[PDB]
Write a protein that binds this ligand. Structure first.
Ligand SMILES: O=C(NCCc1cccs1)c1ccncc1
Lengths: 237, 300
Protein backbone atom coordinates (compact mmCIF):
# COMPACT_ATOMS: atom_id res chain seq x y z
CA UNK A 1 0.00 0.00 0.00
CA UNK A 2 1.34 3.43 1.20
CA UNK A 3 4.98 4.25 2.23
CA UNK A 4 4.93 5.93 5.74
CA UNK A 5 6.99 6.52 8.98
CA UNK A 6 6.04 2.93 10.14
CA UNK A 7 7.75 1.20 7.09
CA UNK A 8 10.77 3.55 6.46
CA UNK A 9 13.66 0.99 6.77
CA UNK A 10 12.04 -0.66 3.70
CA UNK A 11 13.65 2.10 1.54
CA UNK A 12 17.13 0.69 2.41
CA UNK A 13 16.50 -3.07 1.92
CA UNK A 14 17.83 -5.01 -1.15
CA UNK A 15 14.53 -4.84 -3.19
CA UNK A 16 15.33 -2.34 -6.00
CA UNK A 17 12.99 0.67 -5.74
CA UNK A 18 12.68 4.13 -7.24
CA UNK A 19 11.04 7.34 -6.03
CA UNK A 20 9.46 9.36 -8.86
CA UNK A 21 8.75 13.08 -8.24
CA UNK A 22 6.90 14.96 -11.03
CA UNK A 23 6.77 18.40 -9.31
CA UNK A 24 9.38 19.97 -11.69
CA UNK A 25 8.13 18.39 -14.99
CA UNK A 26 5.80 21.22 -16.13
CA UNK A 27 7.24 24.64 -15.07
CA UNK A 28 5.96 28.11 -16.13
CA UNK A 29 6.58 31.83 -15.62
CA UNK A 30 3.21 33.73 -15.47
CA UNK A 31 3.33 37.18 -17.19
CA UNK A 32 1.10 40.08 -18.50
CA UNK A 33 0.45 40.33 -22.30
CA UNK A 34 0.52 43.67 -24.21
CA UNK A 35 -3.34 43.74 -23.90
CA UNK A 36 -3.05 43.26 -20.06
CA UNK A 37 -4.18 39.57 -20.16
CA UNK A 38 -2.11 36.85 -18.44
CA UNK A 39 -0.16 34.16 -20.32
CA UNK A 40 2.27 31.40 -19.32
CA UNK A 41 5.71 30.70 -20.77
CA UNK A 42 6.93 27.09 -20.16
CA UNK A 43 10.55 26.60 -19.07
CA UNK A 44 12.56 23.38 -19.12
CA UNK A 45 11.63 20.82 -16.42
CA UNK A 46 12.79 17.43 -15.17
CA UNK A 47 11.59 14.11 -13.80
CA UNK A 48 13.31 13.24 -10.50
CA UNK A 49 13.68 9.43 -10.37
CA UNK A 50 15.83 8.30 -7.43
CA UNK A 51 17.10 4.93 -6.05
CA UNK A 52 17.21 5.81 -2.31
CA UNK A 53 19.55 2.85 -1.55
CA UNK A 54 22.29 3.71 -4.16
CA UNK A 55 21.75 7.48 -4.64
CA UNK A 56 21.37 6.88 -8.44
CA UNK A 57 19.36 9.82 -9.87
CA UNK A 58 17.88 9.37 -13.38
CA UNK A 59 17.19 13.05 -14.23
CA UNK A 60 15.09 13.15 -17.42
CA UNK A 61 15.14 16.72 -18.73
CA UNK A 62 11.76 17.85 -20.12
CA UNK A 63 12.45 20.38 -22.90
CA UNK A 64 9.68 23.03 -23.56
CA UNK A 65 9.26 21.57 -27.08
CA UNK A 66 7.27 18.58 -25.65
CA UNK A 67 4.44 21.07 -24.72
CA UNK A 68 4.17 22.69 -28.19
CA UNK A 69 0.59 22.52 -29.53
CA UNK A 70 -0.61 20.39 -26.57
CA UNK A 71 -3.68 21.17 -24.33
CA UNK A 72 -4.25 20.52 -20.55
CA UNK A 73 -0.49 20.56 -19.88
CA UNK A 74 -0.73 19.87 -16.07
CA UNK A 75 -2.63 16.62 -16.97
CA UNK A 76 -0.28 15.78 -19.89
CA UNK A 77 2.75 16.27 -17.56
CA UNK A 78 1.62 13.35 -15.38
CA UNK A 79 1.23 11.03 -18.46
CA UNK A 80 4.57 12.19 -20.02
CA UNK A 81 6.21 11.43 -16.60
CA UNK A 82 4.63 7.92 -16.57
CA UNK A 83 5.69 7.42 -20.28
CA UNK A 84 9.36 8.37 -19.52
CA UNK A 85 9.53 6.24 -16.29
CA UNK A 86 8.04 3.29 -18.27
CA UNK A 87 10.66 3.93 -21.03
CA UNK A 88 13.46 3.97 -18.36
CA UNK A 89 12.32 0.69 -16.78
CA UNK A 90 12.18 -0.97 -20.29
CA UNK A 91 15.77 0.34 -20.95
CA UNK A 92 17.20 -1.41 -17.80
CA UNK A 93 18.27 -5.07 -17.81
CA UNK A 94 15.66 -7.24 -16.02
CA UNK A 95 17.94 -7.66 -12.91
CA UNK A 96 18.14 -3.78 -12.56
CA UNK A 97 14.37 -3.14 -12.98
CA UNK A 98 12.72 -1.88 -9.78
CA UNK A 99 10.32 -4.16 -7.79
CA UNK A 100 8.51 -0.99 -6.53
CA UNK A 101 8.06 2.57 -7.81
CA UNK A 102 6.97 5.07 -5.12
CA UNK A 103 5.31 8.28 -6.46
CA UNK A 104 5.55 11.42 -4.30
CA UNK A 105 2.08 12.60 -5.49
CA UNK A 106 -1.09 10.42 -5.61
CA UNK A 107 -2.06 11.97 -9.02
CA UNK A 108 0.90 9.97 -10.55
CA UNK A 109 -0.62 6.58 -9.49
CA UNK A 110 -3.10 5.96 -12.36
CA UNK A 111 -0.83 7.34 -15.13
CA UNK A 112 2.10 5.14 -13.95
CA UNK A 113 -0.09 2.02 -13.36
CA UNK A 114 -1.55 2.34 -16.91
CA UNK A 115 1.95 2.79 -18.53
CA UNK A 116 3.31 -0.19 -16.47
CA UNK A 117 0.42 -2.72 -17.15
CA UNK A 118 3.10 -4.81 -19.02
CA UNK A 119 4.95 -5.09 -15.63
CA UNK A 120 2.33 -6.63 -13.27
CA UNK A 121 5.07 -7.63 -10.71
CA UNK A 122 6.21 -3.95 -10.29
CA UNK A 123 4.25 -2.41 -7.34
CA UNK A 124 3.24 1.28 -7.91
CA UNK A 125 2.88 2.91 -4.44
CA UNK A 126 2.06 6.28 -2.89
CA UNK A 127 3.79 7.60 0.23
CA UNK A 128 2.56 9.44 3.40
CA UNK A 129 6.12 10.96 3.58
CA UNK A 130 6.17 14.70 2.60
CA UNK A 131 9.45 14.55 0.64
CA UNK A 132 11.13 17.79 -0.43
CA UNK A 133 12.20 16.54 -3.93
CA UNK A 134 10.59 19.76 -5.45
CA UNK A 135 13.81 21.47 -4.17
CA UNK A 136 16.01 19.41 -6.62
CA UNK A 137 16.06 22.52 -8.82
CA UNK A 138 17.87 24.36 -5.92
CA UNK A 139 20.95 22.09 -6.54
CA UNK A 140 23.02 24.40 -8.79
CA UNK A 141 24.44 21.66 -11.09
CA UNK A 142 20.96 20.05 -11.62
CA UNK A 143 19.34 23.49 -12.29
CA UNK A 144 22.22 24.23 -14.77
CA UNK A 145 21.86 21.08 -16.89
CA UNK A 146 18.02 21.51 -17.02
CA UNK A 147 18.03 25.23 -18.10
CA UNK A 148 20.87 24.71 -20.69
CA UNK A 149 19.12 21.72 -22.40
CA UNK A 150 18.09 22.46 -26.05
CA UNK A 151 16.51 18.97 -26.50
CA UNK A 152 15.15 16.01 -24.44
CA UNK A 153 18.09 14.43 -22.49
CA UNK A 154 18.59 11.92 -19.61
CA UNK A 155 21.46 12.90 -17.20
CA UNK A 156 22.70 10.42 -14.50
CA UNK A 157 23.89 11.70 -11.10
CA UNK A 158 24.69 10.16 -7.72
CA UNK A 159 22.75 12.52 -5.41
CA UNK A 160 24.82 11.17 -2.42
CA UNK A 161 28.27 11.98 -4.00
CA UNK A 162 30.73 9.56 -2.22
CA UNK A 163 28.80 9.60 1.12
CA UNK A 164 28.02 5.84 1.01
CA UNK A 165 31.83 5.21 1.45
CA UNK A 166 31.40 6.57 5.02
CA UNK A 167 27.66 6.36 6.00
CA UNK A 168 24.70 3.99 5.45
CA UNK A 169 21.93 4.69 2.84
CA UNK A 170 19.54 5.39 5.78
CA UNK A 171 21.91 8.17 6.99
CA UNK A 172 22.58 9.43 3.40
CA UNK A 173 18.81 9.70 2.65
CA UNK A 174 18.29 11.52 6.02
CA UNK A 175 21.07 13.99 5.10
CA UNK A 176 19.61 14.47 1.56
CA UNK A 177 16.04 15.06 2.89
CA UNK A 178 17.37 17.56 5.53
CA UNK A 179 19.40 19.47 2.85
CA UNK A 180 16.41 19.56 0.47
CA UNK A 181 13.91 20.52 3.22
CA UNK A 182 16.28 23.45 4.14
CA UNK A 183 16.67 24.50 0.44
CA UNK A 184 12.84 24.34 0.11
CA UNK A 185 12.14 26.42 3.31
CA UNK A 186 14.80 29.16 2.72
CA UNK A 187 16.97 28.61 -0.37
CA UNK A 188 19.20 31.69 0.19
CA UNK A 189 19.94 30.74 3.84
CA UNK A 190 20.47 27.01 2.98
CA UNK A 191 22.91 27.98 0.14
CA UNK A 192 24.89 30.42 2.39
CA UNK A 193 25.29 27.59 5.00
CA UNK A 194 26.54 25.15 2.29
CA UNK A 195 28.84 27.54 0.34
CA UNK A 196 30.00 30.30 2.84
CA UNK A 197 33.42 28.59 3.45
CA UNK A 198 35.44 28.75 0.17
CA UNK A 199 38.10 26.27 1.51
CA UNK A 200 35.45 23.43 1.29
CA UNK A 201 34.76 22.99 -2.45
CA UNK A 202 32.50 20.82 -4.67
CA UNK A 203 34.48 18.20 -6.63
CA UNK A 204 33.82 18.44 -10.43
CA UNK A 205 32.04 15.00 -10.27
CA UNK A 206 29.93 15.93 -7.09
CA UNK A 207 26.79 18.01 -6.31
CA UNK A 208 27.57 18.95 -2.66
CA UNK A 209 30.71 20.23 -0.89
CA UNK A 210 33.48 17.86 0.32
CA UNK A 211 32.65 18.14 4.10
CA UNK A 212 34.58 16.02 6.64
CA UNK A 213 32.41 13.91 9.05
CA UNK A 214 32.75 16.71 11.72
CA UNK A 215 31.84 19.43 9.20
CA UNK A 216 28.70 17.44 8.07
CA UNK A 217 27.56 17.46 11.77
CA UNK A 218 27.96 21.32 11.91
CA UNK A 219 26.20 21.70 8.50
CA UNK A 220 23.38 19.33 9.59
CA UNK A 221 22.98 21.40 12.85
CA UNK A 222 22.81 24.73 10.89
CA UNK A 223 20.10 23.22 8.58
CA UNK A 224 17.87 21.99 11.48
CA UNK A 225 18.22 25.52 13.06
CA UNK A 226 17.32 27.23 9.71
CA UNK A 227 14.20 25.00 9.45
CA UNK A 228 13.28 26.04 13.06
CA UNK A 229 14.41 29.76 12.51
CA UNK A 230 12.09 29.83 9.38
CA UNK A 231 9.32 27.93 11.20
CA UNK A 232 9.55 30.70 13.91
CA UNK A 233 9.70 33.59 11.34
CA UNK A 234 6.68 31.88 9.58
CA UNK A 235 4.40 31.19 12.63
CA UNK A 236 5.75 34.21 14.74
CA UNK A 237 6.90 31.68 17.50
CA UNK B 1 -51.52 -16.96 -21.28
CA UNK B 2 -48.62 -19.14 -19.98
CA UNK B 3 -48.71 -20.73 -16.52
CA UNK B 4 -46.14 -21.84 -13.94
CA UNK B 5 -47.94 -24.29 -11.66
CA UNK B 6 -46.64 -25.23 -8.17
CA UNK B 7 -46.92 -28.80 -6.77
CA UNK B 8 -47.57 -27.19 -3.31
CA UNK B 9 -46.17 -24.51 -0.92
CA UNK B 10 -44.95 -26.43 2.15
CA UNK B 11 -42.96 -23.47 3.57
CA UNK B 12 -44.00 -19.87 4.18
CA UNK B 13 -42.33 -17.77 1.44
CA UNK B 14 -42.51 -14.42 -0.32
CA UNK B 15 -42.86 -15.19 -4.09
CA UNK B 16 -41.73 -12.64 -6.72
CA UNK B 17 -42.82 -12.78 -10.36
CA UNK B 18 -40.97 -10.01 -12.27
CA UNK B 19 -41.58 -6.68 -10.43
CA UNK B 20 -44.57 -8.15 -8.42
CA UNK B 21 -44.56 -10.17 -5.15
CA UNK B 22 -46.98 -11.79 -2.66
CA UNK B 23 -46.81 -13.75 0.64
CA UNK B 24 -47.71 -17.51 0.78
CA UNK B 25 -48.30 -19.25 4.19
CA UNK B 26 -46.85 -22.68 5.27
CA UNK B 27 -49.13 -25.32 3.55
CA UNK B 28 -51.45 -22.63 1.99
CA UNK B 29 -53.54 -24.00 -0.92
CA UNK B 30 -51.40 -22.29 -3.63
CA UNK B 31 -50.79 -23.89 -7.08
CA UNK B 32 -48.96 -21.18 -8.98
CA UNK B 33 -49.10 -18.22 -11.36
CA UNK B 34 -51.28 -17.90 -14.49
CA UNK B 35 -51.74 -15.25 -17.30
CA UNK B 36 -47.93 -14.75 -17.67
CA UNK B 37 -47.35 -12.59 -20.78
CA UNK B 38 -45.80 -14.46 -23.71
CA UNK B 39 -43.04 -12.55 -25.50
CA UNK B 40 -40.83 -11.65 -22.56
CA UNK B 41 -38.33 -13.43 -20.28
CA UNK B 42 -39.60 -13.65 -16.67
CA UNK B 43 -38.05 -14.25 -13.26
CA UNK B 44 -39.79 -16.15 -10.44
CA UNK B 45 -38.04 -15.49 -7.09
CA UNK B 46 -38.26 -16.60 -3.50
CA UNK B 47 -37.43 -15.36 -0.01
CA UNK B 48 -38.23 -17.78 2.82
CA UNK B 49 -40.21 -16.21 5.72
CA UNK B 50 -38.06 -18.06 8.34
CA UNK B 51 -34.69 -17.22 6.63
CA UNK B 52 -34.12 -14.14 4.38
CA UNK B 53 -30.59 -15.47 3.48
CA UNK B 54 -32.56 -17.83 1.11
CA UNK B 55 -33.05 -15.25 -1.79
CA UNK B 56 -33.02 -17.09 -5.15
CA UNK B 57 -34.92 -17.65 -8.34
CA UNK B 58 -35.25 -18.71 -11.97
CA UNK B 59 -35.10 -16.86 -15.28
CA UNK B 60 -37.34 -18.57 -17.86
CA UNK B 61 -39.28 -18.02 -21.09
CA UNK B 62 -42.63 -19.97 -21.33
CA UNK B 63 -42.11 -20.31 -25.10
CA UNK B 64 -39.10 -22.63 -24.43
CA UNK B 65 -41.00 -25.33 -22.42
CA UNK B 66 -43.56 -26.22 -19.73
CA UNK B 67 -42.09 -25.23 -16.32
CA UNK B 68 -43.34 -25.88 -12.78
CA UNK B 69 -42.10 -25.29 -9.22
CA UNK B 70 -41.85 -28.05 -6.62
CA UNK B 71 -40.41 -27.73 -3.10
CA UNK B 72 -37.43 -30.03 -2.38
CA UNK B 73 -37.46 -30.84 1.39
CA UNK B 74 -33.88 -32.19 1.12
CA UNK B 75 -32.26 -29.13 -0.51
CA UNK B 76 -34.78 -26.83 1.28
CA UNK B 77 -35.79 -24.79 -1.75
CA UNK B 78 -38.44 -24.23 -4.40
CA UNK B 79 -37.00 -25.82 -7.59
CA UNK B 80 -37.96 -25.10 -11.19
CA UNK B 81 -38.49 -28.24 -13.29
CA UNK B 82 -39.50 -28.92 -16.93
CA UNK B 83 -42.52 -31.22 -17.64
CA UNK B 84 -41.81 -32.97 -21.02
CA UNK B 85 -45.37 -34.57 -21.13
CA UNK B 86 -47.44 -31.69 -22.69
CA UNK B 87 -50.84 -33.43 -22.12
CA UNK B 88 -50.16 -34.14 -18.40
CA UNK B 89 -48.99 -30.53 -17.87
CA UNK B 90 -52.09 -29.15 -19.74
CA UNK B 91 -54.33 -31.43 -17.58
CA UNK B 92 -52.73 -30.21 -14.25
CA UNK B 93 -52.90 -26.47 -15.20
CA UNK B 94 -56.60 -26.92 -16.26
CA UNK B 95 -57.55 -28.53 -12.81
CA UNK B 96 -55.74 -25.76 -10.78
CA UNK B 97 -57.32 -22.99 -12.95
CA UNK B 98 -60.85 -24.57 -12.61
CA UNK B 99 -60.35 -24.67 -8.77
CA UNK B 100 -58.87 -21.06 -8.78
CA UNK B 101 -55.73 -21.99 -6.76
CA UNK B 102 -53.46 -19.75 -8.95
CA UNK B 103 -52.60 -16.01 -8.69
CA UNK B 104 -52.90 -13.94 -11.90
CA UNK B 105 -49.84 -12.09 -13.26
CA UNK B 106 -51.21 -8.65 -12.41
CA UNK B 107 -50.28 -6.64 -15.57
CA UNK B 108 -51.92 -3.14 -15.98
CA UNK B 109 -52.83 -2.68 -19.73
CA UNK B 110 -51.14 0.83 -19.88
CA UNK B 111 -48.06 -0.67 -18.26
CA UNK B 112 -44.80 -1.16 -20.24
CA UNK B 113 -42.52 -1.42 -17.13
CA UNK B 114 -41.45 -5.04 -17.63
CA UNK B 115 -40.88 -4.65 -21.43
CA UNK B 116 -38.88 -1.45 -20.65
CA UNK B 117 -36.66 -3.36 -18.15
CA UNK B 118 -36.18 -6.49 -20.36
CA UNK B 119 -36.24 -5.01 -23.94
CA UNK B 120 -32.77 -6.45 -24.85
CA UNK B 121 -32.73 -9.44 -22.45
CA UNK B 122 -32.77 -12.83 -24.31
CA UNK B 123 -33.03 -16.27 -22.62
CA UNK B 124 -30.19 -17.61 -24.88
CA UNK B 125 -27.85 -14.79 -23.60
CA UNK B 126 -28.86 -15.44 -19.93
CA UNK B 127 -27.90 -19.15 -20.44
CA UNK B 128 -24.33 -18.11 -21.53
CA UNK B 129 -23.96 -15.90 -18.40
CA UNK B 130 -25.52 -18.63 -16.11
CA UNK B 131 -24.11 -22.05 -17.29
CA UNK B 132 -26.39 -25.11 -16.60
CA UNK B 133 -27.05 -26.30 -20.15
CA UNK B 134 -29.24 -29.34 -19.11
CA UNK B 135 -32.01 -26.82 -18.07
CA UNK B 136 -33.86 -24.27 -20.30
CA UNK B 137 -34.26 -21.97 -17.21
CA UNK B 138 -31.42 -20.28 -15.20
CA UNK B 139 -31.01 -20.28 -11.38
CA UNK B 140 -29.60 -17.10 -9.74
CA UNK B 141 -29.23 -16.22 -6.03
CA UNK B 142 -27.95 -13.43 -3.75
CA UNK B 143 -24.49 -15.07 -3.05
CA UNK B 144 -23.43 -16.11 -6.62
CA UNK B 145 -20.07 -14.51 -7.50
CA UNK B 146 -18.99 -13.28 -10.93
CA UNK B 147 -15.93 -14.49 -12.94
CA UNK B 148 -14.42 -11.01 -12.12
CA UNK B 149 -15.11 -11.31 -8.32
CA UNK B 150 -13.42 -14.83 -8.56
CA UNK B 151 -10.20 -13.31 -10.15
CA UNK B 152 -9.80 -10.69 -7.29
CA UNK B 153 -14.72 -19.50 -6.12
CA UNK B 154 -16.66 -22.50 -7.68
CA UNK B 155 -16.64 -21.86 -11.51
CA UNK B 156 -19.87 -23.95 -12.15
CA UNK B 157 -22.15 -21.73 -9.91
CA UNK B 158 -20.85 -18.29 -11.11
CA UNK B 159 -22.18 -15.36 -13.16
CA UNK B 160 -20.15 -15.21 -16.44
CA UNK B 161 -20.64 -11.43 -17.08
CA UNK B 162 -18.22 -9.87 -19.64
CA UNK B 163 -15.14 -8.71 -17.67
CA UNK B 164 -14.74 -4.88 -17.84
CA UNK B 165 -11.50 -3.52 -16.31
CA UNK B 166 -10.44 0.10 -17.12
CA UNK B 167 -6.78 -0.70 -16.09
CA UNK B 168 -6.27 -3.83 -18.23
CA UNK B 169 -4.19 -4.36 -21.43
CA UNK B 170 -7.61 -5.10 -23.11
CA UNK B 171 -8.75 -1.50 -22.26
CA UNK B 172 -5.48 0.31 -23.22
CA UNK B 173 -3.62 0.27 -26.57
CA UNK B 174 0.20 0.47 -26.36
CA UNK B 175 1.19 4.10 -27.14
CA UNK B 176 -2.40 5.30 -26.46
CA UNK B 177 -2.22 5.11 -22.62
CA UNK B 178 -3.49 8.63 -21.73
CA UNK B 179 -5.94 8.80 -24.69
CA UNK B 180 -7.49 5.37 -23.94
CA UNK B 181 -7.61 5.86 -20.11
CA UNK B 182 -9.24 9.34 -20.28
CA UNK B 183 -11.56 8.49 -23.29
CA UNK B 184 -12.85 4.87 -23.17
CA UNK B 185 -14.22 5.02 -26.82
CA UNK B 186 -11.66 2.43 -28.14
CA UNK B 187 -12.56 -0.02 -25.33
CA UNK B 188 -16.37 0.54 -25.77
CA UNK B 189 -16.54 0.62 -29.62
CA UNK B 190 -13.70 -1.70 -30.90
CA UNK B 191 -13.08 -4.16 -27.99
CA UNK B 192 -16.57 -4.54 -26.45
CA UNK B 193 -19.14 -3.57 -29.16
CA UNK B 194 -17.39 -4.79 -32.41
CA UNK B 195 -15.20 -7.42 -30.61
CA UNK B 196 -17.24 -9.17 -27.88
CA UNK B 197 -20.97 -8.16 -27.90
CA UNK B 198 -21.16 -7.76 -31.75
CA UNK B 199 -23.97 -5.10 -31.32
CA UNK B 200 -25.43 -2.57 -28.79
CA UNK B 201 -28.49 -4.89 -28.30
CA UNK B 202 -26.34 -7.67 -26.71
CA UNK B 203 -24.49 -5.02 -24.58
CA UNK B 204 -27.80 -3.54 -23.32
CA UNK B 205 -29.19 -7.10 -22.69
CA UNK B 206 -26.29 -7.89 -20.31
CA UNK B 207 -26.59 -4.42 -18.65
CA UNK B 208 -30.36 -4.95 -18.09
CA UNK B 209 -29.82 -8.56 -16.80
CA UNK B 210 -27.14 -7.32 -14.36
CA UNK B 211 -29.51 -4.60 -12.98
CA UNK B 212 -32.35 -7.08 -12.51
CA UNK B 213 -30.08 -9.61 -10.64
CA UNK B 214 -28.80 -6.70 -8.47
CA UNK B 215 -32.37 -5.54 -7.69
CA UNK B 216 -34.23 -8.86 -7.30
CA UNK B 217 -31.49 -10.86 -5.52
CA UNK B 218 -29.26 -8.12 -3.96
CA UNK B 219 -26.46 -9.78 -6.00
CA UNK B 220 -23.39 -7.56 -5.32
CA UNK B 221 -21.36 -8.69 -8.42
CA UNK B 222 -24.36 -7.95 -10.64
CA UNK B 223 -24.56 -4.39 -9.20
CA UNK B 224 -20.79 -3.96 -9.96
CA UNK B 225 -21.39 -5.19 -13.56
CA UNK B 226 -24.39 -2.81 -14.11
CA UNK B 227 -22.31 0.19 -12.92
CA UNK B 228 -19.17 -0.81 -14.99
CA UNK B 229 -21.31 -1.06 -18.17
CA UNK B 230 -22.91 2.43 -17.51
CA UNK B 231 -19.50 3.96 -16.67
CA UNK B 232 -17.88 2.49 -19.84
CA UNK B 233 -20.49 4.30 -22.01
CA UNK B 234 -20.50 7.59 -19.96
CA UNK B 235 -16.63 7.65 -20.01
CA UNK B 236 -16.51 7.36 -23.89
CA UNK B 237 -16.38 10.64 -25.92
CA UNK B 238 -17.61 8.81 -29.10
CA UNK B 239 -20.89 6.89 -28.70
CA UNK B 240 -23.57 6.43 -31.39
CA UNK B 241 -26.51 8.89 -30.76
CA UNK B 242 -29.02 5.94 -30.86
CA UNK B 243 -27.05 4.13 -28.09
CA UNK B 244 -27.08 7.23 -25.84
CA UNK B 245 -30.82 7.83 -26.43
CA UNK B 246 -31.56 4.13 -25.68
CA UNK B 247 -29.26 4.09 -22.57
CA UNK B 248 -31.16 7.14 -21.21
CA UNK B 249 -34.48 5.22 -21.59
CA UNK B 250 -32.98 2.01 -20.06
CA UNK B 251 -31.61 3.82 -16.96
CA UNK B 252 -34.79 5.93 -16.58
CA UNK B 253 -36.96 2.78 -16.16
CA UNK B 254 -34.35 1.12 -13.88
CA UNK B 255 -34.22 4.20 -11.56
CA UNK B 256 -38.06 4.47 -11.71
CA UNK B 257 -38.45 0.78 -10.66
CA UNK B 258 -35.72 0.68 -7.95
CA UNK B 259 -37.37 0.54 -4.45
CA UNK B 260 -36.59 3.86 -2.60
CA UNK B 261 -35.49 1.88 0.52
CA UNK B 262 -32.68 0.00 -1.45
CA UNK B 263 -31.35 3.16 -3.22
CA UNK B 264 -28.49 3.50 -0.64
CA UNK B 265 -27.12 -0.09 -1.22
CA UNK B 266 -27.98 -0.41 -5.02
CA UNK B 267 -26.64 2.96 -6.34
CA UNK B 268 -22.90 3.80 -6.43
CA UNK B 269 -22.62 7.54 -5.44
CA UNK B 270 -19.21 7.93 -7.26
CA UNK B 271 -20.34 6.36 -10.60
CA UNK B 272 -23.69 8.27 -10.80
CA UNK B 273 -22.09 11.65 -9.86
CA UNK B 274 -19.29 11.09 -12.44
CA UNK B 275 -21.79 9.87 -15.13
CA UNK B 276 -24.38 12.72 -14.72
CA UNK B 277 -22.05 15.66 -13.79
CA UNK B 278 -18.37 15.05 -14.98
CA UNK B 279 -18.33 12.50 -17.90
CA UNK B 280 -18.37 13.09 -21.70
CA UNK B 281 -22.07 12.11 -21.62
CA UNK B 282 -22.98 14.43 -18.62
CA UNK B 283 -25.51 16.27 -20.89
CA UNK B 284 -26.72 13.18 -22.88
CA UNK B 285 -28.94 11.43 -20.24
CA UNK B 286 -31.79 13.97 -19.87
CA UNK B 287 -34.53 11.56 -18.65
CA UNK B 288 -32.16 9.73 -16.23
CA UNK B 289 -30.68 12.98 -14.81
CA UNK B 290 -34.24 14.36 -14.22
CA UNK B 291 -35.57 11.21 -12.42
CA UNK B 292 -32.29 10.84 -10.37
CA UNK B 293 -32.40 14.56 -9.27
CA UNK B 294 -36.13 14.34 -8.30
CA UNK B 295 -36.00 10.87 -6.62
CA UNK B 296 -32.42 10.59 -5.15
CA UNK B 297 -31.08 14.19 -4.73
CA UNK B 298 -29.39 12.96 -1.45
CA UNK B 299 -27.18 10.47 -3.43
CA UNK B 300 -26.02 13.32 -5.74
O1 LIG C 1 -57.81 -17.48 -2.36
C1 LIG C 1 -57.66 -18.35 -3.24
N1 LIG C 1 -56.77 -18.26 -4.24
C2 LIG C 1 -55.35 -18.56 -4.04
C3 LIG C 1 -54.34 -17.53 -4.74
C4 LIG C 1 -53.38 -17.07 -3.64
C5 LIG C 1 -52.20 -17.68 -3.06
C6 LIG C 1 -51.72 -16.88 -1.77
C7 LIG C 1 -52.45 -15.75 -1.44
S1 LIG C 1 -53.77 -15.44 -2.50
C8 LIG C 1 -58.53 -19.56 -3.29
C9 LIG C 1 -59.32 -19.93 -2.19
C10 LIG C 1 -60.44 -20.75 -2.42
N2 LIG C 1 -60.72 -21.32 -3.60
C11 LIG C 1 -59.88 -21.05 -4.61
C12 LIG C 1 -58.80 -20.17 -4.52
Amino acid sequence: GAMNSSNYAELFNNDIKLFVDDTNVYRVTVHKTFEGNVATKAINGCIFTLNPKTGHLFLKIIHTSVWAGQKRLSQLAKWKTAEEVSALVRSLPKEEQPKQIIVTRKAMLDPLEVHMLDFPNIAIRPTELRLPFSAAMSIDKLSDVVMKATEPQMVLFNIYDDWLDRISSYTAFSRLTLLLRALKTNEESAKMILLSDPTITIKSYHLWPSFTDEQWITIESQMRDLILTEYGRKYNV
Amino acid sequence: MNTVPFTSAPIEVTIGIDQYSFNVKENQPFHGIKDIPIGHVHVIHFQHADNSSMRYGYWFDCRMGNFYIQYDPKDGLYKMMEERDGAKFENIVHNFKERQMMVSYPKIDEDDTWYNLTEFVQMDKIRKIVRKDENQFSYVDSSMTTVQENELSDPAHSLNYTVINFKSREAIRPGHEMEDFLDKSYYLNTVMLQGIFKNSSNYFGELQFAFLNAMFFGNYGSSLQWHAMIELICSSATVPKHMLDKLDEILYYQIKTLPEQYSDILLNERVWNICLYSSFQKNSLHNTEKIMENKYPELL
